[PDB]
Design a protein around this ligand. Sequence first.
Ligand SMILES: [Mg+2]
Ligand SMILES: [Mg+2]
Ligand SMILES: [Mg+2]
Ligand SMILES: [Mg+2]
Ligand SMILES: [Mg+2]
Ligand SMILES: [Mg+2]
Ligand SMILES: [Mg+2]
Ligand code: NA
Ligand code: NA
Ligand code: NA
Ligand code: NA
Ligand code: NA
Ligand code: NA
Ligand code: NA
Ligand code: NA
Lengths: 1010, 1011
Amino acid sequence: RRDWENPGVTQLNRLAAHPPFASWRNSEEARTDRPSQQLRSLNGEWRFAWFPAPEAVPESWLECDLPEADTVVVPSNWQMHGYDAPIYTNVTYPITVNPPFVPTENPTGCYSLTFNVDESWLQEGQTRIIFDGVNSAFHLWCNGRWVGYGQDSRLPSEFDLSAFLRAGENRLAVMVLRWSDGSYLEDQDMWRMSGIFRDVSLLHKPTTQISDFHVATRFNDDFSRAVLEAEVQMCGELRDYLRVTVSLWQGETQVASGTAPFGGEIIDERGGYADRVTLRLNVENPKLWSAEIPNLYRAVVELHTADGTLIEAEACDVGFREVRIENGLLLLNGKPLLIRGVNRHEHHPLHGQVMDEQTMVQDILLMKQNNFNAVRCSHYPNHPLWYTLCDRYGLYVVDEANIETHGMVPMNRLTDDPRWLPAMSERVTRMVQRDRNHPSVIIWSLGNESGHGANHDALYRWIKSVDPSRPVQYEGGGADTTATDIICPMYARVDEDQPFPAVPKWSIKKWLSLPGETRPLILCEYAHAAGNSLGGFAKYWQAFRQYPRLQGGFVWDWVDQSLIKYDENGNPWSAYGGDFGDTPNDRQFCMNGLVFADRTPHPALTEAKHQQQFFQFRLSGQTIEVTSEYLFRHSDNELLHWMVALDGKPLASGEVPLDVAPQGKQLIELPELPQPESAGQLWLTVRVVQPNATAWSEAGHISAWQQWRLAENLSVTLPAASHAIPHLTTSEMDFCIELGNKRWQFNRQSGFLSQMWIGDKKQLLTPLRDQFTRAPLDNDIGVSEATRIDPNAWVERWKAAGHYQAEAALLQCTADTLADAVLITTAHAWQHQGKTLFISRKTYRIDGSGQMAITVDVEVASDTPHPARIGLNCQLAQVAERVNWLGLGPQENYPDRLTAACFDRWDLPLSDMYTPYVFPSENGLRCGTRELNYGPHQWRGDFQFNISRYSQQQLMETSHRHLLHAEEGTWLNIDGFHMGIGGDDSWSPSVSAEFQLSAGRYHYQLVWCQ
Amino acid sequence: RRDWENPGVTQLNRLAAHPPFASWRNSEEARTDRPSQQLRSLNGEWRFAWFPAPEAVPESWLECDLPEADTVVVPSNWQMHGYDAPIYTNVTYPITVNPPFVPTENPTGCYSLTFNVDESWLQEGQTRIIFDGVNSAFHLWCNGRWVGYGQDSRLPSEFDLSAFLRAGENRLAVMVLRWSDGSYLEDQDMWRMSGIFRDVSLLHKPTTQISDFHVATRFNDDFSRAVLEAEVQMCGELRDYLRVTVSLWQGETQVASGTAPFGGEIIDERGGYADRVTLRLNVENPKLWSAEIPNLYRAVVELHTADGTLIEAEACDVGFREVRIENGLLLLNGKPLLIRGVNRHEHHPLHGQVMDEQTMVQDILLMKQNNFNAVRCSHYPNHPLWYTLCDRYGLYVVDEANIETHGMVPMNRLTDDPRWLPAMSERVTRMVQRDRNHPSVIIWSLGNESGHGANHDALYRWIKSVDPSRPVQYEGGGADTTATDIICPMYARVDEDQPFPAVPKWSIKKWLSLPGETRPLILCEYAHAAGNSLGGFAKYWQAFRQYPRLQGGFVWDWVDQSLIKYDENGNPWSAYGGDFGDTPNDRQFCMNGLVFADRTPHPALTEAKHQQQFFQFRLSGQTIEVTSEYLFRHSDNELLHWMVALDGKPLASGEVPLDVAPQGKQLIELPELPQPESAGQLWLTVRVVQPNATAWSEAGHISAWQQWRLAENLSVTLPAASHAIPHLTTSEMDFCIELGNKRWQFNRQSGFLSQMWIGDKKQLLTPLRDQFTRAPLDNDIGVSEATRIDPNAWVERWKAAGHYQAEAALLQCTADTLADAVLITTAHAWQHQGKTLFISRKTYRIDGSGQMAITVDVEVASDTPHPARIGLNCQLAQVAERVNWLGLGPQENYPDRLTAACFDRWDLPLSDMYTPYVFPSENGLRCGTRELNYGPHQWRGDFQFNISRYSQQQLMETSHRHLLHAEEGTWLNIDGFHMGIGGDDSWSPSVSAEFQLSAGRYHYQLVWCQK
Ligand SMILES: [Mg+2]
Ligand SMILES: [Mg+2]
Ligand SMILES: [Mg+2]
Ligand SMILES: [Mg+2]
Ligand SMILES: [Mg+2]
Ligand SMILES: [Mg+2]
Ligand SMILES: [Mg+2]
Ligand code: NA
Ligand code: NA
Ligand code: NA
Ligand code: NA
Ligand code: NA
Ligand code: NA
Ligand code: NA
Ligand code: NA
C-alpha cells in the first residue's frame, strides 16, 4: 500500500485528538496535578536497528528482537546516535520534489520495546499508547500484530492496544520512515532529522470515559465578572445515573462547582448531543491572566455516578483572559498588547530536536529576564510541556500548525490544491483540539511559508468557527491575505519599502495605512539575528511605541541551530550545515539566534532586553519621569537606582522606591548635585532593580536602565612646559624620534610607524597602518557564494572595488622640528586597477611629554562602495591580561547597536573583548570610547575599537571558531568610524543609510602615550 | 483493509477531477462539439454476478469470467434487474447507524467486461477509464491486476490504465459495494439502489496534455463590454515551443482568439506556475446568457507547437453572465431574479436512477412549457449531460454537493466532526472542479439536511475562495447560518411562523426583516406536492412579486419516485415504499412530484404554470394593462388573444400583437363591445400565445392567461306558469311525488330521497344523503399511522371526533302541498357518543316544471374539528360517456388551488373527471360550478363537485390506484362548500384558516332537473 506516499492516508486506526489527559481516579490528585498511576511513561532504553529502506526490514523483526540491534535511549533522533547524518537545508527540500513520492532509499528506524502490562489494565477499561512525536511517519505492531499508522511529526498519535496486549510481557515494534508524503508539509528551515523524538506513554481510561472537554471564559465590560463554560463529551454506554461535575479552584479554595447529567440543548431538527453536557460557572472578580501576572485557576472535570462514585477525572490550568481585535487593535483583557516576542525552534546541541523540561525552563527564564513576553512556535506544535510552562510562567504564545512547503514552486502549489486539503486540515484541526484549553495560546497560526492557497482560507474559517476566542494569523502570500486577522510580515523594514512583485514587503508604518487596511500589524519574524547582528533594532521599537497599530513582533530567532561534533582529541566544537557530509546544505545559515546553542547569550541579547524595557524615562532639570508600559501590574517589585559620575568617577547616587500604576507616571526629583571640580562630562545612569526574587528571576535583577549626559566642563587648562624636547634623527630610510626611554621609527619608503621602543623592547609586530575593511559579518555576506556570487552583497561590492586588495602608495613623508616637538607628515593613496579608492593624510606630533598626537584626514572616492571602517590597526608585540576603557560597554556594541551599552569605566579580561561567533567575523568592537588602556599603552580621543589575539585576516579566512589560533601579540583595531552591522534580514544589504560611511571626507584624532 | 469502512480512505489511485474532456485531435470537431474518436463509450453488455458480501467473491473472478454470471446492460442499478430489493427510506438510514461501519452482509455486485484496445492507444499517450457514477463504492482491476478504489456515488472516478492494458482483448473487473462509509453522507430521501448507474468510458490523452482549464467572464458597468479569461493547465514535459490558443466563437463566426506560451505571472516568493497560462479575450457587445435567452459562445482550447502542430483540443459552451448579490438581491446581469424553480431527483420508473438524454430533454421541455426557469440538483451532482442541456435550453441551476446526513442525531454529528472533513471536502471540491465552466450553474450548494457543522463553514469559504463568480447556499442548521449567502429555508410559510427550537421556520416576509438580516430569501424547498396538493401556491407568488428580497423558491418536487412492478398477469403498476419487501420503509412518501413517474402531469402542474407566468395583467374599463416580468427579452414571439363570453357562449374575440419591453407595460383597449341579449355574467379571458415554435415549444403554445368578470345582468324574468301540478301520495313509509313521467320517493324512516324515476327507470343506486367527510388526501394524513397515530393530523381529528362513523338521526320529515308544487321538509342530526356534530335542515320543492329545488342549511358544532366538506352525495344508477359543466376547469381544482382554472363551458369524457393519484384520495373536484350535466340530469346552483366510478369509501380504503374497481353506476359528490387541500408541507396541518369550514352555519341550494 505504501501509505507513506499517499497524502490521502495520513493515519490508520488512530484515535481522535483531545486535550491533555491523565485519567486520574482521585479528584484531589487531579486538582493538584500530581502524577497519575493511569499514565505510564515508556521512555527509557529501547532496541533499535537502522535500515536503508522499509523493504530491507526482515519479517522476523515483527516477532522478536533482531540480534544486530542496539539498545538506545528514547526519545531521541537517530542521527544524534550516529546512525545516519542530519541534514541542514533551508528552503530546498532534502528530497527530489516529486509529490507524493519519496526516495526508494528511505532511512528506516526499527524501534522495539519489551515491557510489562499489569492485568488490572486489561481486566477492564481501555489501554492506549501515545507517541507524542514520531518523525516523520510510522507503522505500529503489538505482539506481532499490525495496529496502525500515523503522520505529522509534531502532534501525538494514539492507538487503542486493549485487544493487542496480554498480562505480563509484551513487545512493541515501531517502523519509523524518515521520508513520507508528510515531508512535503514539513520543509521548515532546520536540521532534518527523524525517529521517536518525543515521549511515548500508556494511558488507561475506563470504558465509560471523558473523551474531550473545552474550557471557555467570557466576561462583562469591565472584567469584574465572568462565566466559565465547560463542554464535556463522553464515550461508552450512556446511563441516566451518570454525572459530570466541573469545579473551579484558586489555590485550595473552591471558587465554584456545578453538576449535571449528560444531554445537551437541542441543536437541530434531529435533537441534541445526548453524549455531551455543558456546565456554566459564575465567577465574581476573577483574577485575570496575562504575561505580567499569570494568575491561574484549576478546573477539575469529574465523571461520576449519581450516588457519588468517581469514574475518572481530568483537569487543566485555567487562565481568565479575553483576546480580541477591536478597531484595528489586538487587545488582551481590554488593553492593547505590545508583543516583545521571539521565534523559538525546539533545538538542543546534543539531543537534536528532543526537548526536556530543564532546557525549556532555562529558555523561558532567559526570555523573561531579557524582557520578552511572547514566543512563536516556529513552525509546528511544541512538546506538550511547553504550553504548561508558558501558562504558569506567563508568556503569550502563537501556536502554529506543522505546515511548511517553502521548497515548492510556486510556494502555494500544494496549499492551493484541494487534494492536499485533507492532510493540511489534520495538521490544523488536531493542533486546535490539543491546545485549545491553554491560556498562554492567544493566537493560532496556519503554518509557515506555504504561499497562500484556497486550503488556507478554508482552514482559517474552520478555526474562526470552532474557536472564536483567538485570532488567526498566517504570513504566506503577502502577509495581509484573507487568511489572516493580523498583518504579520517577516522582515518588513521600518521606513524602507521592498516592492517585490506579488508579495511586496512594505515599510510597516506605510503598510498600516494602505487604502482600506485596518488590521493590527505584528511581525511574525524580524531582526534576523545571524551572528554580529540586530543593528537597527532600536528603530523597530521606536516605531512600535509611536504607532498604536504596530504591536510588536517576533525576533528571528532564539537559539543557534548548531550541533556538537568531536575532533580527534575528543574535544567538542559547534558544527553547522555540511559538517556531517550532508549535501546539498545551507552551511552557517542555521545559526541566527540571540543565544548560542548552549544558551550562552550573544551580545545582541542585551540590546533586545534594553529596547524591550517596560519602563520609559525622560529627564528635565532635576526631574526624572518614569512611565510604566505594563498594562495590568503596579510596580510592586521595583526600586530606581541613580548614579552620577564624572568620566566614570562616582560623585553621587541614591535609590527611590518605584510606585507607578500600569500606564502611569512617577516624577522623581534628584537632590541638588554639587558642581564637580575637574573638567569632564557628567553622566546620569538610572536602573530599575527588583529587590525580591520571582518565579523567573533572582533578587537584584536589573530590568531596565537609561543614561543622559548632564553638565559638561571643557578642559581649558594648559599643560606645564615639557622638561625635555624630542630629538629627530634623519636617515635615508627612516625618521627616528627619541625622548627619554622611548623611541619612534617611521619608515620613509612605506610612510608608516614601523616600530616603537620602550627601553630596548619593541612594542609592535606589525606597523601602524590605515584599515578600511573588516572581516565580513553574516549580514555583509548575505547569500553570496563562490559558486553563486551575489554582486549586490556588501562583501562582494567591497571585493570587486578592490577594498581587500588595495595597496598603500606613499605620496608624502616629511619630518619637521618644532620648538618643543617633532612633527611627521604623511600622505598615502590606496589604489586598485589604477583607481584611487582612499587617500589618508596624517600628522604625528610627539612632544616633550612623550605623547604622540595622531591626526587623520581621509578622502573616500564617491563612486567606490562605502567602506566597512576608517581607522588604523597594528599588531602589538605584548599580551596583557586586562583591557580597561572609558566608553560604551561592557559588552560588544556597534553604531547601529549600541543603545544598550552604557558610558562608563569598564575593565574586562582580554578574552571578553572577543565574541565567539561560530562563524568568525569582525567582532568585539566597543564604540564611543574616549580612553583605552592596555599594558603600558593608553589611547585617547573619540573612537571605536576591538582588541584580540585574532587578526581581521584570520577571522575572514576561518570558517569555524574552533579553528582559530591565537596569534603572537595582540591585534588592535582603532576606528575613527565604523559602518553599521545591519540585520533587518540576512540576504540583502540592510545597513541603514545613516550608518553607512558616505561622507566622503573623514577626520579623527588619537593620542598614544604611556 | 476494508477501505469501505474508513472515511479516511475515499479513493486510491484516482486521478484529479476536471471539466468534461474529449481530447479532440481536430479543432473543427472541438468547435462544433462533434464526437471524438479519443472518447470511447464502454456502455452496453457487461457480465454481472451478485454476491451477499465481498467475502463471498471468488478469487477466480479476477482472472476470468464466472460461468454463473449473467449478461446485463450497463449503466444500470442492479435492483432494477431484480438481483436484490431497492429500499425506500426517507430519514432513517437503511443501515444500522454505527459510523464508519456497514453491515457484514453487504450486497456486492461484480461487473466485468472484455473489450478491445488498439495498439495506437498504447504506443503513445495516456489511456484512462472513466466511471461517471458508481453506487456506492468500488475496487477496480484490469487484466487481473488491482488498479484503484473510489467513493462518492455522484461524481466521476477516473483511473489511469496505461500500464495495465495490452493491444487487443482486455478484461475489467469491478466489485461494487452497496454500503460503505460513503453511505453515511448519502442519506437523501430516495430509493436506495446501487451499481454502475452512469456511463463508463475510455479517454485517450497525449502525454503532454491539457489537464484543466477555467473559463470566466467579467463585464463593465452596463455589460456592453466583457473580458473572457481562460486559465489553462498542462501536464507532461514543458517545452519552449509549446503554445496554448483559446478562440471564441459565436456560431460560425470567430469573435476572438489569443495565443501564448506557458508561464503564468509571479504568484509568490518562489515564482509562478510554469505549467499554466491565462488568456484574456476582449468581447464588445457580448450576447448575454440567461434562462430567457440562452445565448452561447464556444471556447476552443488548443494545445499545440509553435510550428502549428495540434497536440490536442478541449472546449466548452460559454455563457456570458454575471451572478452577484448586491444590496440584498441576487442579480443576473444586473437584474433581480425571480426564481421559478423546482427540485429534481434523477428518477425513472423503469431504469431506476439511470438517466438518459430523452428523459432529460422531456423534463426540461415540460419545465419550460410550464414556466419554470430554474432547477435545484437535489441533492447531488447530476449526470453530466444535464448541465449541457440546461446551458443550451436555458435554466438556472443550483449544483449541490452529494452530502446528506439527515439520519444522524443530532443532524450535524458528522459535519461538525473534523475527522469527516476530508470526505466532505472531496464531495464539494470535485463538484466545483467538474462543473465550474457551465453557465447554467449560478449557485453552489453545500449539500442537504446535514445540520450545520464547522466543516460547512470551511467548505463554504473554500468555494468562495476558488470561485467568487457564484453565491454559495446551504439550508442546514436554520437556513440562515454563516454558511449561506442566501436565506434558503424549506417549507417556511408565507405569513405563519413556526418557532421550532434552535431551527425555527419564520414566515418568509418576517424572516427578511429580522434585526440585522440583509440577505435575499429563496426557498430551497416549498409547496410540497404530495398527491392532491399545492393548495395555497398563489399565496407564495403574490409574496414573491410584492417583496423584492423574496426571490422565489424551488418546488418539492418534480417527479413521483414510483417504480413499475408487474402483477400475476404481467400488467404494470406503480409501486412505492414497501412494495419490494423493503423494510423499514416510508411507503408513499416517495411520491410528491408535479408529474407522475412517466411524466404525465398531475393537475397541480397547471396551477404552477399559471402562478409562474411571465406576464401580469390589469383591467380598467376597456383597457387591458400587460406588464412584462421578463428581465432581458422583448415579447417578440407573443400575441394576445382575448375572448368575451356570456355563460360560456362566445360573443366576441380578437387578437392583438404584444410588443412589451422587459419590465415594461403595454396598454390594449378592447373594441366597443355590444351588449348581450339574455341575462347572465359576461367573462373576459385573455391568453398569451407564441405564434412561432421555439427549441422548447410548438407553435401556438399558451404561456399565460387571466380572466375577469365584466358586466352582469341578473335574470329578473319569471318562468311561464307550469301546465301540470305535482301529485303527493302519503304512505306510512314514504312521501311519493309524481309529475308526468317523473317520480320522487322520500323514505319517511330515513328522511332521504331514496329513489327517482324517469319513465320506469330508477335513477339512484344509493339514496341522496349529506356528506361531511372526504377520502383523506396526503396532506390530511401527514405522518400518521395505525402504529403511530398523529393526533394533530386532520384525518385523526376527524376520526377521533367521529366524523366518519356519525349516524344520521331523523328529527323531522313532513310533506306540504302548495298551489303549484309539493314541499318536503327534513332535519337530521349527526351524532357520535351522544355528541351532535352536525344538523342538516332541508326543503325540497318539486314544481310543475319538473324541477326539484333543494335548499340546505347546516349547523356545525363550533367545538368539533372543521369538516372536510358540506354537501350531498349519491350513487347514480347510470353511467354516461361525457360530463358537461359551466364552471371552473377544465382540470381538477380546489378552493385553495383554483387560480389556474377558468370559468367556461367544459366537456370531458367521464374518465378525465378522475385523477389517478397513485395513493387514492378525494380527487377530481371542480369548483365554482353553476351548471352540471350528466346523462339526463342537470344540476344548477353554485357548488363544487366530483363525479366518478369510485366511492369516497373505496378511495379511502384502497392503498394503490391499480387496486381500485369501478363501482356500479356513478358516484356524485356535490358540495356547497369544500375545505382547502393545503400543502405548505405534508407532516403538519397546512390548510390556511380562510380555507377551513369554520363558519358554524352554512347555506347552499341546488336545483335538480332533467336536461
Ligand atoms: Mg501518507
Ligand atoms: Mg522556510
Ligand atoms: Mg540610551
Ligand atoms: Mg472509505
Ligand atoms: Mg491478448
Ligand atoms: Mg432528507
Ligand atoms: Mg385569475
Ligand atoms: Na504600538
Ligand atoms: Na537562518
Ligand atoms: Na516597587
Ligand atoms: Na570567517
Ligand atoms: Na421578489
Ligand atoms: Na416525500
Ligand atoms: Na410579439
Ligand atoms: Na387511500
